[PDB]
Amino acid sequence: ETGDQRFGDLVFRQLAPNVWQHTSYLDMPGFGAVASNGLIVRDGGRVLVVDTAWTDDQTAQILNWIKQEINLPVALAVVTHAHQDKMGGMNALHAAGIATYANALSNQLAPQEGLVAAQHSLTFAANGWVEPATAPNFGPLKVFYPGPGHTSDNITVGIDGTDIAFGGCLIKDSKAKSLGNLGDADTEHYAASARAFGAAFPKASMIVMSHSAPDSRAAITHTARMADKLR
Numbered sequence: 678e679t680g681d682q683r684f685g686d687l688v689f690r691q692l693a694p695n696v697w698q699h700t701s702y703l704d705m706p707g708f709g710a711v712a713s714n715g716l717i718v719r720d721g722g723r724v725l726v727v728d729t730a731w732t733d734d735q736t737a738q739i740l741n742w743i744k745q746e747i748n749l750p751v752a753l754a755v756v757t758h759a760h761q762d763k764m765g766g767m768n769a770l771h772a773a774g775i776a777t778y779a780n781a782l783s784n785q786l787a788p789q790e791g792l793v794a795a796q797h798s799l800t801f802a803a804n805g806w807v808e809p810a811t812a813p814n815f816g817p818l819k820v821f822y823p824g825p826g827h828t829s830d831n832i833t834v835g836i837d838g839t840d841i842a843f844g845g846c847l848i849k850d851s852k853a854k855s856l857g858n859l860g861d862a863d864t865e866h867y868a869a870s871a872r873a874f875g876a877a878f879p880k881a882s883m884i885v886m887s888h889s890a891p892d893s894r895a896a897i898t899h900t901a902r903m904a905d906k907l908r
């Protein structure tokens with residue numbers, strides 16, 4: 678659509694005045710060319726990234742796009758679990774000198790997953806909110822661990838000052854026929870974790886997610902319902 682700017686085999690879509698969705702694609706036998714989404718946030722004179730693309734080369738295109746279209750330094754990136762669609766491009770971020778952050782558990786898992794760990798580890802209070810001293814300079818990004826679901830390590834991100842909350846791999850859209858790739862999922866706890874995400878960001882009306890276009894809060898409801906069926 679008109680909002681879907683094309684650049685370097687990726688797609689960039691403005692969602693709010695200072696927020697864009699990045700989308701990259703990986704062709705895999707049996708799956709088609711699977712889209713994965715992350716975010717780009719301008720916070721004053723700097724840019725913040727949520728999630729890499731599937732590959733280093735694609736993630737380099739995210740950074741090229743930022744330079745062309747925003748032309749401000751990228752201060753940090755936060756990646757939302759140790760799977761290829763979210764952390765496949767860590768080397769590109771590190772080649773740009775960008776400080777990278779992930780759940781401590783994601784950093785522990787990354788090497789066995791064939792991924793490069795983020796430089797910095799986030800830890801979370803018992804109620805799920807990030808311990809702020811582990812998320813220095815996060816600006817409007819509000820990071821929440823909802824519990825195991827799509828993976829054990831999945832985290833979520835709200836953008837303060839906007840209507841947006843990012844569910845990453847945890848949340849699928851209201852028309853989705855399944856929960857996507859459950860290979861590393863916690864099927865017992867998924868429904869509660871999806872609901873915890875919704876309760877952490879109760880003001881959010883635009884739910885952004887890894888594998889479908891932004892949706893209403895019906896994405897959370899429908900995801901939790903599909904997840905309840907797994908119990």
Ligand SMILES: CC(C)c1cccc2c(-c3ccc(Cn4cncn4)cc3)c(C(=O)O)[nH]c12
Pocket residue numbers: 705708711760761762827846849850853854855856857858859887888889
């Ligand atoms: C583990 C990771 C590297 C990976 C590889 C290949 C596919 C996926 C998917 C995925 C699979 C199917 C669909 C189709 N679909 C659309 N809405 C509901 N299902 C969507 C995503 C996910 C995911 O679910 O995070 N991770 C993936």
Ligand code: NA
Pocket residue numbers: 835877878879880881
């Ligand atoms: Na909220």
Ligand SMILES: [Zn+2]
Pocket residue numbers: 758760827828846
């Ligand atoms: Zn995943």
Ligand SMILES: [Zn+2]
Pocket residue numbers: 713760762846887888
């Ligand atoms: Zn995914």
